[PDB]
Amino acid sequence: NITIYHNPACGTSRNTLEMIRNSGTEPTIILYLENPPSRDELVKLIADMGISVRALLRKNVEPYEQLGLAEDKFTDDQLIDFMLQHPILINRPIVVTPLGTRLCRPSEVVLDILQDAQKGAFTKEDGEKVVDEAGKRL
Numbered sequence: 001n002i003t004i005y006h007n008p009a010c011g012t013s014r015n016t017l018e019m020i021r022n023s024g025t026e027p028t029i030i031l032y033l034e035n036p037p038s039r040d041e042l043v044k045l046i047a048d049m050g051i052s053v054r055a056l057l058r059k060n061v062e063p064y065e066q067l068g069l070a071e072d073k074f075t076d077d078q079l080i081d082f083m084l085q086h087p088i089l090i091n092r093p094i095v096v097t098p099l100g101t102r103l104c105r106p107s108e109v110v111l112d113i114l115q116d117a118q119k120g121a122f123t124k125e126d127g128e129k130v131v132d133e134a135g136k137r138l
């Protein structure tokens, strides 16, 4: 039903996971740094997310820096294969539900693809209010 490609060390990923749970479902959790998607799966995720390959790339990580990926010298498939070989390059979290797939940056993007409403108010771990008790986005 719901899958999250999760990094426990990222607040955005933690907040997204807690919003999923606050809709009343426990997702399948894939620790993508250890169990990355296959090439076919990553291609499908990107298609369904509706963003460019480069938009999925995480900047400010060692392979991005050392491979010079900031420069516009790479095709989409070159970037995909770097993501598969260096999964820390895949930005996070990616969430799949029956409604669609999103790169949930910022975390509250996940509200778009959660079928069931938040079960009560939601406040991010840093105290940023997201939905009030009535269900309204702030």
Ligand SMILES: [Cs+]
Pocket: 035, 036, 037, 038
């Ligand atoms: Cs896999």
Ligand SMILES: [Cs+]
Pocket: 111, 112, 113, 114, 115
């Ligand atoms: Cs929704």
Ligand SMILES: [Cs+]
Pocket: 011, 126
């Ligand atoms: Cs933050």
